[model samples]
Structures are given as structure tokens and as C-alpha cells.
Target chain A: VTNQLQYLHKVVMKALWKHQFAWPFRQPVDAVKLGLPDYHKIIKQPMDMGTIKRRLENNYYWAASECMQDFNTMFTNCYIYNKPTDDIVLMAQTLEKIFLQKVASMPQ
Target chain B: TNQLQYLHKVVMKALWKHQFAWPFRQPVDAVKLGLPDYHKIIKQPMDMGTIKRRLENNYYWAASECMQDFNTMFTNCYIYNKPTDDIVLMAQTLEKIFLQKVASMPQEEQ
Candidate 1:
């Protein structure tokens, strides 16, 4: 891989593990189909039966899925970036900083 | 927007408005940063799954910056989208569970 490609992989992978990966990027169907249990109640969008069909036809699910495939593979079995000590440390710091805490809050 | 649409809107509004502790000193423009197909994803109609993921995304990206304010903001913002007490209760329960996971991580030193 070119140095640039390597760098991009590291950067995107770093974000993926960091929880910085926004879930909106997931496939719309999979996103809705999450098995969080009763999570269905909180959702209040316009998703009557008709729109689900339309959302299915949009064919945008792979955009997020393809990205996930790339991000999920690094440094693991059947993947690249083995034991990337330096990258791991960087990822640790990023993930640590990004996850939520009790005191911190979201916007109103 | 109708009651349902409005409920979806404020949840989104809360996500969009939530602040993240961006890693850069200079703000990086996402458009400049670039994600072609990804950009259009959020423009589609909102749904429960979309809101949940977006909310979690905001939580992930915003970190401490957005977490502290999200609950209060989310609760109040969507309060008016009342369906029944039971629905809000179920939603809030899920929110509570997710928020707890967020806090289970070790705190980072600023």
C-alpha cells in the first residue's frame, strides 16, 4: 500500500474503535433492526410500512457497510496492522477521550 | 411536523447540536474531510433506529463535551412529543441503559 493509503487506514481504524464511528452510517435496515429490545418504542420517525420499502430501495446501505468491513478487519485474524503498538496507543487515547461519562452531557 | 415527526426531529436536533471534543486545534470541516455517500445518509427520513444510532454517534463523537448535556436536552426536547406515558418510559429506559454503558469506561485525564 502507498504511505497515504496506510495512513488513511490507520486513521479511519482509530476512529472506528474510538466509538467515534457514528451509527447513522450503518445500513438503514440494520440500523432499525438493532436488537436492543424495546428500543423500538423510542423511535418516532415516519417509518410506516410504506417508507420501509422505499428506504430499502434507496440502496445506500452498503456505503456504511463497506466502511465497516474495512474498519473491522485491521490487526485481527485475516487482517492487516498486526500488533501495531504505536497505533494501538493512539487508538486508546482517542477512545478514552471519546466515550461518555456521567458528568459530561449532551446538548439541549 | 406531526407529533411523530416532531419527536424524530428533536432527537435529531439533539444529536446535531451535541458538541464533540474534536481532536484538532483548528476545526476540521467534515465536507473538507470528505465522505461522499455518507453525507446524504442523514437526509433521509428519521426512524427509531436512525435516532438511536445518531444519538449514540453523538455520544461517541462528543465524548464528555456532549454527554453531560445530552440527557437533559434529550428529555426536555422530546417531552412534548407525548404518545403515552408508557412509550416515553420505555424510551427513557433504553436511554438510561445506554448512558450507563457510556459511563462504564474509565475517565480520561484532561
Candidate 2:
């Protein structure tokens, strides 16, 4: 049962990374280079797909819900930093919707 | 905007009155609690007090925006607390109450 759940998680993560809107979230935001100095100040806990992938690989998550939480944080951080109508915010929302759907479809 | 604020204020009052709302009434104190990793794990910490302040300050533009913060508060609890923990159960119960109240609110015309 554990292995099955892990496999399902990996598969879902792959789908998320493959998404077009996934580009911005593929790795942690480059706050310094991106010229958003206050990004860290505003977003206390930053998350991204790459970090999630590494954590998954390292068996950092105790349950699928924990992993899901990280994804939620990633998207929420975007909403905090970007304007509601910004394209990047829209991309985050789109990708998050896809992530939720994929998680829902997974068998328990 | 006045209407939106009024509606949110009403919902906030109901949430504050819930019995299960005790656990989420204030922000988690990681330092004092000795849960050093709490902040590291739960990125966006939220609570009823913060939401109440935001609502009073007219921080939310839409009802959905306010709802999202409530969702964040619950989600943070879910992430940090064990699923079997009573705190998680309280969050689940309060979150349901919050959702129901949100549903009953008159929809904002976009």
C-alpha cells in the first residue's frame, strides 16, 4: 500500500512539472536575481515543484496530504507576491487546479 | 465594498463563536511552544485573530478572498498537526462551519 501511494505521488508530480504553467514553479523563485527583494519578507515559507520533487525523493513526506500542503503553500505564496490579475498568478492558479484534480483522482 | 465587508464581518462573528474555534483563535507560537520547525513546515501561518484584524481593516476585496485566508488557516493546521490529532479534528469541524456560512452569503456580482 505504501509503495502504491508513493508511485501515485510520483506520477502526479510528473504531470504537474510537465504542465505549461509549471515553468515558473519548477524551481524556487530567484528572489535576488528577479529583483524582488521583499519576496522572502512577504512569503515566509517559499515552496516550488523542484523542492517538492527532492523532498519526495528523499522520503520527506509522511503522507500525501503533507505533500499537497507544500503545493498549496507554493501557490499561496504566488498569490501573496503577485497581483491577483498578474499572468504569473493566473499560471499558479491553473497549475494548482490541475494538481488538485490529479490528487483527487488518485486512489486512497 | 461596504456590503462585502458587512457580509464578511457577519461570517467572522459566527466563526469566532464556534466551540471548535478555540485552537485557531490565535497564531501558533513556535518559539515558546518549542516546535522550532513549526514555522519551517507551515509557511503561511494564519488564525482567527489575524483574519479578524484584516476584515476590520477592509483587507479583503471579495468574499472569496476572505474565504481563502480561512482555508489557509485550516490547511496550515492540517499540515502541522497529525491527522489523528484532536486539533486537526477541530480544524475540520470549524472549516465546515466556515464553508457553510460562506455558501449562504449572497454572491458578489462580478
Candidate 3:
């Protein structure tokens, strides 16, 4: 179960990273550098694709749901920090839609 | 009031019965677990017992607030424990169950 889930996570992550709007989500948001002082205050659990990928390579994820939870957190953080119609939020929404679709097609 | 209370009870009952719910049933013992830095990493710690207390005391104004604590509980677990750890898997499974229950709830209640 563990090995199979990891493989599935890798596949989904690859697809996510390949998306055009995935740039902002590829790495952790530098809250201070970006001048988003309240970023940590709003987002308690920060996550990014790069961190997810590194965790995957290190065998940190044992189940697909665990990886999915991180993705959810990542997108949720975007939604909280950016305005609803903001470009970054829109990009996050698109990536999230694609992610859920991929998760739905995975084995149960 | 009755409907919201009922909804909260039902979800809490479902969570309590889940197999993976054991790990999060109460607060983590930082001293015993040797995770002294847990509180440092996870600023807002949450657990099932805390949620239950909040439910009993009518501490939540909306279902979203209750669910947010649940999210905090699971996210704290993810933050402190290694993803490969059994406790992490338990948290993940229980979180999925909690989310499904929340999704099935009435839109207005959420």
C-alpha cells in the first residue's frame, strides 16, 4: 500500500508541476521576502509542491490521502491569503481542480 | 440550534468510531513523546478531546469553526510527525473520514 501510494503521488505531482500556472506553487512562498507579513498568521500549515516533492523523494508520505491533505492545505492557504479574484488564487483554483480530478481517478 | 447541535453530534460520533481516531483522541504528550519542540513547530495544537469539549460547551458559533479545529488537529499531526510514521497515516485516514462527513453536511450548516 505504501509503495503504491508513493508512486501514485509521484505521478500526480508530476502532472501538477507541469501545469502552466504551477509556478507560484512550485516553491514555498517567502512571506517576508514577498512582503506578505500576515502570511503565516493566516496560513497555519504552509505547504508547497517543492516541499511535497522533497518529502516524496525522502519516503515521507505513506498514503495518498496524506499527500492530498498537503495539497489541500497549499491551495487553502492561497485562497486565504489572496483575494478571490486575484490571479494567484485563480491559478490555485485551477490547479486544485486538476488535483481533485486526478485523485478521483486513483485506485480506492 | 437543534439542527446544528445534531449535526455536530453526528460528525463527532463518526470520528470517535473510526479506527484511525485513536491517535488523536487526546492531547499529545510532548514530554513523554520526546517531542519537546512540538509546540514550537505547531503553534496552535488541537486534538479530538478539545473539539469534544468545545462541542459540549457550545463554543462554536458555526460548523466551519468546529471543522477548522479538526483541520488544525490533523495539520498539527502532519507538521510534527514524519509522513511515513504510523501516526501520520492514522491522522490522514481520520482526516479523510472527517472531511467526507463534513462534505455530506447541509450546505447551510457548513
Q: Considering DockQ, where higher is better, how would the candidates rank from best to worst? A: 1, 3, 2
- On TM-score, who's better, 1 or 3? 3
Q: Which of 1 and 3 is ahead in DockQ?
A: 1
- Lowest lDDT 10-residue stretch of candidate 3 chain A: A99-108
DockQ of each two-chain model: 0.06, 0.03, 0.05
Residue lDDT tens for model 3, A2-91: 643554466678889889999989899999778999788766688999998888778787666577778877876675566534688668
lDDT of 2 by residue, B35-84 (tens): 88888766678999998888879787765566667767876676566434
Q: What are the lDDT scores of the predictions, listed in order?
A: 0.32, 0.69, 0.70
For model 1, the stretches where C-alpha displacement exceeds 4 angstroms are A1-102, A105-108, B1-62, B66-73, B76-78
Off by over 4 Å in 2: A1-8, B1-110
lDDT string, candidate 1, B25-81, tens digits: 122234775745322422212233434454445433434443333433323212322
- Candidate 3 — which pairs collide? none
TM-score top scorer? 3
The residue-by-residue lDDT of candidate 1 on A41-82, one tens digit each, is 534331221232233345423332222222221111111111
Predicted candidate 3 versus true structure: per-residue lDDT over B1-110, tens digit per residue: 43247445777888887888887888887997788888776667899888989888888876656666776777566556643468866776686676555434544332
Top-lDDT structure, candidate number: 3
